[PDB]
UniProtKB/Swiss-Prot annotation, chains A, B:
Protein name: Acyl-CoA:acyl-CoA alkyltransferase
Gene: oleA
Activity regulation description: Inhibited by cerulenin.
Lineage of the organism: Bacteria, Pseudomonadati, Pseudomonadota, Gammaproteobacteria, Lysobacterales
Principal EC category: transferase
Site (Important for activity): H259
Length: 332, 332
């Protein structure tokens, strides 16, 4: 009768399986810089912007012309293994990548066809910059909770190679334009997939509780000074919302799985919220920003390291273009 | 305890408001054909493929460089008026268009910012070719049903002008390639938006019951002979599913609001299912295929014509690239 925060949380939604794919090829910021040197020289800019301002030592790239759907499909096969279920069990497949094979059909229908889903399997893409994998989790969770389905896949493959190819070409003949282009050189490749399920079908798997979103769509035109200040302001509001629904206090969370934009942005965020940096696994310095796949890759890598115990409270969160901010909880 | 079809239907989800935007400019197939004549002549093809095979007399185009987000925003303003609510009430805004301003941020965040949504408003894009507006309705419905929100916007703006510009340029210097390009000349421009709400907040508005999806993702590579046969096979399965959940028999539905691909595809569909053509409003011959906006535009135009009575059972359905097929019901 009387609303309470906890009411909107999911009771019956679990994480059956989880996997990631590291893209194989290392591209160092040192090697990029040699290609950019002569235009560093010409513009008169003596600063290693990627290595010294962003904090990226390297990113991963695909070795071949991998489509988003291929990377997602690889990750999905691994996640099904992790969940020990066959594709016939999946009732929903949501693709959340920024990378996209086509305008139509959906990347999800391409991945679904690759995997061999059944005729009952609903499929579509969600796009929301860096936050879409959490949005896909929540969309799937609602359907699991209600019982419309028993198992869902949420998949995300990202490819940056053609971005890099083109960006590096376009900054080897203006400072204003050239500084805009440096930011694409912090992106990386990779994939992730998650099998979600109804909790009773999967007794004692990790629980997805759901979470909260706040937005500042007034800022949909985004600098980087401004992405940062407005982004932190938005996160603050969002943490209030998380307190009100999830009961969050920063000190009670065991791990923060955080979308990563750059070394200084992350530092600023963790400082502003008094987060312990030891609870913030980071892959940005050697993998770059994997867009919406960053959050589930980091979760999967935490899992694989044996970094988690039954009961551990894991915060999934990011700030995305929009601006949007989403915060959700997994209890391992 | 025992599942029944009706269980998954939404009980508490209504349609508060609905609007569409007709794009202003008429472009006749006669005028296109004069531009294509000399390449009709060169390839030796004497058939009016657009006028005589597709059945499109004209399509609507924008007069100016309208972005999808602008068209969606226009439609959304009209829908809020139709619902007699201000933007502050909206808790969710989903954009479903194929047309898209950017890779990031979402088109939805751009529309949200234009409208002035509150900081509590969740936003994202769903992409699923021609069926995404029904997918967006259902995603919103789940959140309305559970009470996470009270009012949602589902918006869709489409623009084909740059498609036309480029396609007409690219077929005025191979038959195989040229026939592939004729199909883009059946697309049209337009927009639609829908305000959904919790039924008690909106006593006696149209009810959204939800619906069903079946898929044939084996066919994500799609001819047109094959789009048709496999598409009808898929629709047949989907109608079985609709029977099992919604209780559908074709003769008990009052109106069929059907995504439209072409005159012969529609004819084939309606024949194959024994549908009465008088219950199938069509705008394709003068507006062309508006992609995922086609279904809500047709619904809105039915509304505006005074074509609906309290209690009327309206079938929303389409076949989309994937292949996917979705079928849902509104009770006016
Ligand atoms: C901590 C503050 C961060 C400011 C936000 C920047 C937006 C980041 C990006 O551009 C992408 O990496 C993620 C995204 N945009 O959705
Ligand atoms: C009635 C049979 C139809 C065959 C399906 C064709 C796909 C149609 C399209 O290409 C678009 O108009 C709609 C869509 N593809 O999602
Ligand atoms: Mn290599
Ligand atoms: Mn005009």
């Amino acid at each position: 009768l009387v609303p309470r925060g906890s009411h909107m949380l999911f009771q019956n939604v679990s994480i059956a399986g989880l996997a990631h794919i590291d893209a194989p090829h290392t591209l160092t910021s040192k090697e990029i810089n040699e290609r950019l040197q002569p235009t560093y020289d010409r513009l008169g800019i003596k600063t290693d912007v990627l290595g010294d301002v962003a904090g990226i030592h390297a990113r991963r790239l695909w070795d071949q012309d991998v489509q988003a759907s291929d990377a997602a499909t690889q990750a999905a096969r691994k996640a099904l293994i992790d969940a020990n279920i066959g594709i016939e069990k999946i009732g929903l497949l949501i693709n959340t990548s920024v990378s996209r094979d086509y305008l139509a059909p959906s990347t999800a229908s391409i991945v679904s066809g690759n995997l061999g889903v059944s005729d009952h399997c609903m499929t579509f893409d969600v796009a929301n910059a860096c936050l879409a994998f959490i949005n896909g989790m929540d969309i799937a969770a609602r359907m699991l909770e209600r019982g419309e389905i028993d198992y869902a896949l949420v998949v995300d493959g990202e490819t940056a190679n053609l971005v890099y190819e083109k960006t590096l070409e376009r900054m080897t003949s203006t400072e204003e334009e050239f500084r805009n282009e440096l930011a694409a050189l912090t992106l990386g490749c990779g994939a992730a997939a998650m099998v979600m399920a109804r909790s009773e079908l999967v007794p004692d798997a990790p629980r997805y509780k759901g979470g909260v979103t706040r937005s500042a769509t007034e800022w949909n035109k985004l600098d980087t000074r401004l992405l940062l200040i407005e982004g932190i302001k938005l996160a603050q509001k969002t943490f209030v919302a998380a307190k009100q629904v999830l009961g969050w206090a920063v000190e009670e969370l065991d791990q923060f799985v955080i979308h990563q934009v750059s070394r200084p942005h992350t530092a600023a965020f963790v400082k502003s919220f008094g987060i312990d940096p030891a609870k913030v696994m980071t892959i940005f310095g050697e993998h770059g920003n994997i867009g919406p796949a960053s959050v589930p890759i980091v979760l999967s890598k935490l899992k694989e390291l044996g970094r988690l115990k039954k009961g551990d409270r894991i915060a999934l969160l990011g700030i995305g273009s929009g601006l949007n901010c989403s915060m959700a909880e997994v209890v391992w």
